[model samples]
Target chain A: VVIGEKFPEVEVKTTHGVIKLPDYFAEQGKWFVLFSHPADCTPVSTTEFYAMQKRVDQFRELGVEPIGLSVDQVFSHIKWMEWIKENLGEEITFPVIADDRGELADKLGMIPSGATITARAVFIVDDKGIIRAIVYYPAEVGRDWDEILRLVKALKVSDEKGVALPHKWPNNELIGDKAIVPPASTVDEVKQREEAKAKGEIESYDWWFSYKKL
Target chain B: VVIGEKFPEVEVKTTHGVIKLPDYFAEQGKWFVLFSHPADCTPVSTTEFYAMQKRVDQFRELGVEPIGLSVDQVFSHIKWMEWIKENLGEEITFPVIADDRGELADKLGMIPSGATITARAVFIVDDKGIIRAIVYYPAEVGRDWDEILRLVKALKVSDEKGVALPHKWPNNELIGDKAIVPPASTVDEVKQREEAKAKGEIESYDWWFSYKKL
Candidate 1:
């Protein structure tokens, strides 16, 4: 679904059990990260899944649940999860959807035309069931989980304080002497920001380049 | 254009002059990062463009040219460039496309349906003129240039050496204990990798998770 639109309700056959997505969101009362891969037991997919597994607790701390999906069957997903645990010494606690028939992939528009596998796509949905962020990657390239985490943190803060993140701004940290930008929409807001800057209230590069501490 | 497909030729008007993208790629003989935003003179856009301007030489050292684009007119772009240089102490040396008629945005699929502004999309094109990577960000969220640079570095290394980067791999550096994955597609390749591991030729977490020194 598009950003700011309610994600359509769908039944997901995850590793845990059958999960109704709408009910799951309502029950969890937290944000969710739904990521799709090309397949199971592949090189890039293996690395990404393991990375997510390692950081499961970190995501949960932010009130976010991470779920994975692929076009592989439930049996294959179970086997791969076991293989990763047995061989790589990492446990897969998250539920993975077995979209063997491409039902969920098709519904989410994850698969592109002429592509047999789903593109590496990530959808960040908030507790309200509205998609906040969407990212797409090629099959050969793996997802950068740090970037994903940073985006979630940025989105969380932006939603709470009504500010925009500056380029490469760290999560809840200032970047050297630079600061994050405060949301400025109209000329009056810009003037008010300038007045605040002149009074030594906030740091700013200029009228339009004002920033706030996280 | 889709990844692995030849990027279509388009005429871009920049502060430097009119540039035909194909010829520019051929003449420069380097990777090109074509990024688009909703417009200029906005807080997010201003911060992002300044960040790129600050790191222009870093990208140059990686043999990549960073180009900016928007639907703003050429005169507005020039004025914005001058304004940033004069006010923010950041000079924009790179070319920015004046997509006044939305021709390039439409062809590149940068404009989403029912949206008046172009999404913050970044297209990475290699020297061979193939689109290697594509990333999209909403208007509210700014593009993470560090992540873009990291992905380019990973792609370059993967191309030079047949390997896949692990999740969140440091740019041009190796983690303390983590290993990269070797290219193993067949059973024989896996066996060969195992044999190499037995011979102590490379470090490996397993048969499929081997890494080498760059």
Candidate 2:
């Protein structure tokens, strides 16, 4: 699905149960993050599951649901989560999709062409059902679930606060947790921003570039 | 143009001069990160440039090249860089590609189908001319250059060490800077790992799961 558009609708059986996506989470005013790993039981994928399970509470606190996906079947998904829980000490409370033939993976571009398994792809769908953001990485490297969580936070700010976000928003090297003022496209706003800058309401590198603490 | 394949070869004019992609950087024994901002003179884009400029030395020392792009003309890129240096206090020494018609952006999937401007897309190409990783974000939120740098470091480690990388490597929440032992694919290697685990040469949650500092 494209960004700013509704997530492509689909239904599939997961370890938890079969449910309609976006509607299941979005209709209930919850955002959902769908992420894929190459395979289950592998160290990198296991470490990722471990790291994310550690942050399950944080995800719930943000009104988001986390879902895992792989080309493995439902039994393998269930079995792997069992292994992940028994050995790694964190029960994967999230639903995991078992795309045996990778039907969903193919539709979402999760798995690459040269391989049978999936890449580290993530789809961040908002409560409105829009595909707000997407990130991709190779199978060789594990993802930073913290970074994904950070993007969800920033995406919320962008919509609710109506402000631009800085790179590394909260931990930005230039500004710490300060929000960027949306760019002005008018000559009047240019003069307006300069005046606002003088009054110290917002910081500006120039009239079009500015930031402020919300 | 796919990951693990050759980066599509292209020559284009930039703020610096005309040059070729992958070939120019790869032939020089340097990796290159090709990134695109939506436009010049915008707050998010300006801040992104500022963020990356601060890390120029890090990119240089790591044998990586940083190139910026927008659909704007070369003159705009030059003018914008001038304003950035004068106002934001960072001189953008890297070349900014003038994809005025977005010819290159279309080829590399930099621009979205619905927008004339490019999304916050990045392509990390290595010295071997392989697209090592790809990441995309919406233009509303600026990018984390530091995170991109982290991936470059991790990619290098993966190629050099043949070990899988955990998410947020180095500062990873779980294993800190230790590297993950690649998952054993053979039954003998599995028993081999279990025996090694008893020797304390590595830490493992299971025979297939292990990590060690290299």
Candidate 3:
């Protein structure tokens, strides 16, 4: 589904158990990162999954759940998880869906035509069930976990404070200390900022450009 | 357009001048980052554009061009650029498409139904005219420039070395030093790696999981 739209309801058989999309999010009361790789037992996909496995706790601390998907069967998924744990010394605690029939991939538009598997696709679904972000990458390219975490933090902060984050503004700083754009909801809000500027009440580059302490 | 597909040809008016998409990439002989904001003069869009303006040189060093688009008119875009330079002391050297008619937005699928403005979308088009990557964020969230640069460098390295970049692999390090997945193109290559491992000729975690110096 598109951004701001509720993710479609679908039942998926994951390593954790069977999960219904809408119910899963509602039950967890957290954001969800649903990503799909091309296949299992591939080097790129293995690295990608292991990377996520490393950061699963960080994601959980932010009230977000991470799930994975591939067209590989359940047996393959189990064996691969076992292989990763046994070989790499990293356990994939997050559930991975085995979309053997390509049902979920087809429903989520993950599969492109004339292709047997999904490309690298990431969907960030919010606590309210709306899809907030979508990212696509070629099969040969692996995913970036830093950017994924940044997006989650940005979305959460924006929702909490009604502010926009600047580039590379990590979420660790206080919201007021972060680079933020002034609210420009009304023309009066824009004009008043100029007067407030002279009184040292606000920080602004111009009437339209401003950054608060947060 | 989807990844691996040729980006659709379109002419656009920008602060620099009028230009065609394919022609511009061909003339520059580099990759292109074509992004869109919600509108001109809005707080979020302003911050987003200024962030991009600040990074134009970095993008240039990586052989990538940065262009912007919004549904605003050419006059608005020109005025906005001037305002940024005059007020923020930062000049936007790159061309920003003034898609007032929304023709390009519609053709590129930037605008979703019932949305008056385009979402924060970043399209990374490679030198060969293929859409290499696609990222979309809601109106409230700004794009992450670090991730964009990382993706560009990763794609370039992958193209150069025929290797896959592991998660969070910075581009500054030599490709050989970076964490990379081996080329598992065929069973013969896998078996060869096994034999090479016995002779201590290659470094690998397993036959399937190997890391090369370059």
Candidate 4:
């Protein structure tokens, strides 16, 4: 389901840190991403971590928090974070959860025995603590950082505007018919939306938001 | 979990067609990607389906079944497909499940009611009826076809080699050091692998695979 009736709160311990799901969400304000890497200290996983580091500021600007998780211990995560900072010359401000006991993994179903260690998985949780989206890639393929950022933006639009984001919905573009009320409808909301459209308060493309200009 | 311990089977009725999961998976040993679009006949959805049409041969060549679903009734799906065939002049060879009652969506948790419709969801189920992967996108955003295609290749590598696929792992890349090997390794297997590496039968980027150019 897009929004689970209730979000499942999970706790994770990583080599770099320890955190509870509730506290993390409380800090991030409901919209957050949980990225599950295979394990710590791997080359490909490290590359992804660096990519996340590069986009860390943008994530914060969007009011979204990005966290990492695996079945590795907190000490392992800590060492890896240190290694990353030393080697890459950058600091990752996000928290990493060490789920050695697979407690969180079991709840999120991020691990598939034999096929992947932790599996490349991502979950988008909305402000209500409901899981709004989930993505899982096999361990070989890396997650797309650009797409992740784009998705966060799209989800934000859906939450705020009460409309569906169309395919390739560029930033600030009209999101959908829901985002724009048909002029013919003559409803009060439609009038307000039309006025918004004219004044450029809310750019509309058919029915979705236009995020490209924004 | 990327791949679930058990895959749930159900019948789906999409705007394009009807599908039975158990029978569909039974016909192929290769992996299958069951993706759902938010709706059919919509502008963004049309473009997304067209994208699928353009890559139909590529997905088929990779030995994977690409199935689509939507909650729209079967009649609407047939009309949409006809419209696509007539206007776009492209035939969609893949099957799209018709899910008017939302039985399948509910079973798979594909629909995000709060977001107005089913979010773009993808499920990769292996031959044994075990779900291998799940990807979800909100309605405003479109799924990345390249990533979807890459994921199928990655899943194959993981299944055949029993090695996890790393991020952005391209085709024919080196599988990482066997992370789950027995405590004592077999000399013959090691020798064979080393010989293969020496002969350039396999490419390596650190522990990641570097596939040879075609």
Candidate 5:
């Protein structure tokens, strides 16, 4: 139920490779995305995988590694990867976790009751091991990759600037201006309050503080 | 299971009034996004709705309508709409279909047995009533609106120009180049074709064929 909590660690072996959640994340200084689909070899998941294959390089260039997960065995993942190539004439580059025992999926809370296999879950974890965002899609629906990329871009901005984006935040242009606050006490002793205000003083609540939109 | 097929005709009850699917779609000549989440009042769904509400006008200006759906009743939809305004401090201009009996959901193939209530599903239906694209996300995840807009834009170009989009296609880019086919007529026609090719005549499948980046 938490959106911004740290992702739980779980070890799992994939068909293409083996991975330990915490250690895999520890090696990367950049942001990373952990996404799960329903069982592999399904039509819906295939199209979504195609979209991911198309955007994997873009995701990598943006400093994010795209990792996939599902509650299927490693062989199913490999067969489907080949089927996708033969049928759709496309390839998958990311390592999809074969969480047949649901270790990683269970730890991530991806396998809620009543769902066939796994919920469509994605965890975007930042470099400091904090989850910046979490998205859950129902099994019946596929997700828009453009929106995922856009959220990644906005989240990066938010991480650096400490500003929250409004809904449909970046459609054709900037949705709203970032909120601003007043200046620091240490710097204020050297400069007067009125002068700081005139010079556009800002406030701080932590490293993540509110500042005026310029 | 099909995203870009013909949409079904269903009556959706709205607070303002009742509307058919086609009537609602006719308002925008560009594209409309029909997305569904699991039961209302949940944490992940709430954030996704709030995000959409903040970007309502952006969807409109892009010539797209943002319609949300869930298998809840009309009363539940009304209560949630009110809750959204009161808690989020904004009014929802878009329509939320109260699909209590799962009429629309069932026809759209939204319900999958043993899975969560409804996966996060998005269908990019073009102005022509053809399902152009679809995105499905699991219940644990939220969707991205930026890609939705980009897809709407990309589809608009395809609709306007009658071209297919390439992989990872962006807006305002060339769709594809035309393929030249030699004439099926007499030998003289083939000679003329060769001369045209030598003169750098735009090679196309037929005389008038052309390609553009999508």
Candidate 6:
């Protein structure tokens, strides 16, 4: 799904039980990250599942919930989590969707090369059910937890501050945690920007290039 | 449009001149990052274009070319660069695509919410012209240069090493720089894995979960 567009609505049979899409998370006034792997009972997925479990507290702290999906069955998913807990030393409490029929995968356009398995994709859906970010990573190359968390944080920061973030926010090379003031599109706004900057209320490399601390 | 597939071929008009996608980069045996901003001379895009400039050498070191795009005209794009060079103290040498008609933007599915301007999207295309990775961030939340670079590095590493990477490779909490050995798919491969581990060639949490340092 595209950003600013509502995530598709449908009922899903998750490990937690069948639940309505978007509504389940929207009702709770929380954002969620829905991701997919090729399948269950695999090594990379095991590592991913374990890594995701460890970040449960970190994600939840940002009011973000992580859900997983694959073309595997509920039984395989359940047993796979058991294997991870028994051997990998972590408990995965998140609900994973068992799309055995590949229905959701097809709808999300995650399947690759007309193949049976889905691509490694992540969709960051906000509280209003709008998709804020989308990343599609190639198979074999696993996802990055650090980047995902950063994207969520940056998006949230953009929302509250009404400013944009640079490449690596809170640690950017140019402005270091400074938020971008939206562009002054016209000459009138440019003069206003100059006036505002003169009052020590904002910063700008130029009238069109402006910033401020978060 | 998805991973493992060649990027769609089309002629594009840019500040650099007329160039062909995938073919141009493939001919050079260099991967490229094609990113779109909302419009030219805007605050966030200004920061983004400048940020990309500082990372030019870093990206080029990995044989990555950076190309910018928006729905603005070439005259607008060229003048914006002149304005940036005159004010921001950095010369943006990379070609910026003036997709004034939004044909290419629509082709890449980057225009958001039926908006005239494109979303902040980045496409990482490999030397072979395959669409390696894609990210679509909201309008207000700018792209991350660090994550994009890390992703390109991770993809290249996975290709050469024939192994997968963890959440934050080289700094991952679990494996720290260790590359993941693809999952052993069958019972016979599992036995082979135990043998390999005994010989000190690999590491495993179990037969299905394995890793090694690069």
Q: What is the TM-score of chain A alone in each candidate?
A: 0.86, 0.90, 0.86, 0.78, 0.79, 0.92
DockQ of 4: 0.36
DockQ for the candidates, in order: 0.40, 0.62, 0.49, 0.36, 0.05, 0.64
Cα lDDT, model 6, residue A80: 89
Best by DockQ: 6
For candidate 1, write residues A34-71 as lDDT tens digits. Answer: 99988787756887887898789988999889999998
State the lDDT of candidate 3 residue by residue for B88-120, as single tens digits.
678889888888678888776677547868888
Q: For candidate 1, please provide the TM-score of chain A on its own.
A: 0.86
Compose the digit string of candidate 6's lDDT tens values, residues A18-133: 98888999899999999999888776666678888988889999989999999988988888888888887788898999888999888877887658988788999999999888
Second chain only: TM-score per model? 0.88, 0.90, 0.87, 0.76, 0.74, 0.93
Local distance difference test, per candidate?
0.76, 0.83, 0.78, 0.66, 0.63, 0.83
Give me the runs in candidate 6 sitting further than 4 Å from their true place.
Answer: A183-199, B183-196
Candidate 2 off by > 4 Å: A184-200, B183-201
Pairs of residues clashing in candidate 2: none
lDDT of 6 by residue, B1-214 (tens): 6777788898888998989997888899999999999888787777778789989888999989999999998999989999889887989989889886899888777888868899999898888888878888877777778778888889888878778877666676677888888866899977977787999789877666678878
lDDT of 2 by residue, B68-149 (tens): 8889999888888999888768889999898868898888767664888988988988998888887778888888887888
Candidate 4 TM-score, C-alpha based: 0.76
* A95-168: candidate 2 lDDT, tens digit per residue: 99888888888877676648888889899999888887777788778888888888888988888756788878
Which pairs, if any, clash in model 3?
Answer: A175-A214, A176-A213, A176-A214, A177-A214, B176-B213, B176-B214
Model 1: per-residue Cα lDDT at residue B79: 88
Clash count for each candidate, listed in order shown: 0, 0, 6, 55, 43, 0
Candidate 1 local lDDT, B1-214, one digit each (tens):
5566778887788888898885696577888889988888876788788888877887889888999999998898998888888977888999998897888888776775467578788888888887777776666677678788878887777787666666676532234323465566899987887787788667755555566655
